[PDB]
Design a protein around this motif. Structure first.
Motif, PDB file in Angstrom:
ATOM      1  N   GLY A  14       0.796  -1.217   0.000  1.00  0.00           N
ATOM      2  CA  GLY A  14       0.000   0.000   0.000  1.00  0.00           C
ATOM      3  C   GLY A  14       0.823   1.258   0.000  1.00  0.00           C
ATOM      4  N   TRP A  15       0.258   2.311   0.566  1.00  0.00           N
ATOM      5  CA  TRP A  15       0.878   3.628   0.624  1.00  0.00           C
ATOM      6  C   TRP A  15       0.978   4.053   2.064  1.00  0.00           C
ATOM      7  N   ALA A  16       2.104   4.644   2.411  1.00  0.00           N
ATOM      8  CA  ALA A  16       2.355   5.204   3.726  1.00  0.00           C
ATOM      9  C   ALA A  16       2.629   6.689   3.568  1.00  0.00           C
ATOM     10  N   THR A  17       2.197   7.495   4.535  1.00  0.00           N
ATOM     11  CA  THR A  17       2.344   8.938   4.465  1.00  0.00           C
ATOM     12  C   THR A  17       2.798   9.495   5.794  1.00  0.00           C
ATOM     13  N   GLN A  18       3.908  10.184   5.799  1.00  0.00           N
ATOM     14  CA  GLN A  18       4.405  10.770   7.019  1.00  0.00           C
ATOM     15  C   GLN A  18       3.816  12.131   7.118  1.00  0.00           C
ATOM     16  N   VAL A  24       2.241   8.626  11.158  1.00  0.00           N
ATOM     17  CA  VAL A  24       2.378   7.805   9.960  1.00  0.00           C
ATOM     18  C   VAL A  24       1.004   7.195   9.706  1.00  0.00           C
ATOM     19  N   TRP A  25       0.550   7.342   8.466  1.00  0.00           N
ATOM     20  CA  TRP A  25      -0.730   6.902   8.004  1.00  0.00           C
ATOM     21  C   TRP A  25      -0.517   5.942   6.858  1.00  0.00           C
ATOM     22  N   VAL A  26      -0.799   4.653   7.064  1.00  0.00           N
ATOM     23  CA  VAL A  26      -0.704   3.608   6.053  1.00  0.00           C
ATOM     24  C   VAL A  26      -2.124   3.294   5.617  1.00  0.00           C
ATOM     25  N   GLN A  27      -2.326   3.129   4.297  1.00  0.00           N
ATOM     26  CA  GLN A  27      -3.597   2.814   3.643  1.00  0.00           C
ATOM     27  C   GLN A  27      -3.354   1.552   2.808  1.00  0.00           C
ATOM     28  N   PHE A  28      -3.615   0.391   3.400  1.00  0.00           N
ATOM     29  CA  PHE A  28      -3.295  -0.886   2.765  1.00  0.00           C
ATOM     30  C   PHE A  28      -4.169  -1.204   1.561  1.00  0.00           C
TER      31      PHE A  28
HETATM   32 CL   LIG Z   1      -1.395   7.317   2.600  1.00  0.00          CL
END
Ligand SMILES: [Cl-]
Lengths: 87, 32
Positions: A14-18, A24-28
């Protein structure tokens, strides 16, 4: 106010966003959404069904959330600047 | 925020996150 700082992609995860705040926000890619932050002992995990659940420091987690945390620790390697610090 | 003080503190906050999750994963090995 917490701004988005750096966004990274992980195939086939997925995508991770700092964020600025230290979050940290991960969207699997399975519909899951893990959120984690430094200083904060709690972790918020949203599941594919859409339910969001906060979990404290001393709460037994199921393997499905532990696996995503293992994975999040490995995604944390992609925001690390390895340049040496001087001065 | 300053350029040096921001960028150093963000990479410092990231290091603390890795370690926090590492304690957490160990804590879970002891639970319940
Ligand atoms: Cl994200």
């Amino acid at each position: 106010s917490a701004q988005l700082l750096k966004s990274v992609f992980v195939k086939n995860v997925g995508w991770a966003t700092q964020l600025t705040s230290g979050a940290v926000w991960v969207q699997f890619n399975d519909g899951s959404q893990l959120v984690v932050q430094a200083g904060v002992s709690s972790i918020s995990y949203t599941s594919p069904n859409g339910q969001t659940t906060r979990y404290g420091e001393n709460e037994k987690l199921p393997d499905y959330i532990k696996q995503k945390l293992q994975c999040l620790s490995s995604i944390l390697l992609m925001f690390s600047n390895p340049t040496p610090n001087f001065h | 925020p300053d350029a040096y003080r921001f960028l150093t503190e963000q990479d410092r906050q990231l290091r603390l996150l890795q370690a926090q999750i590492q304690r957490l994963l160990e804590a879970q090995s002891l639970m319940p």
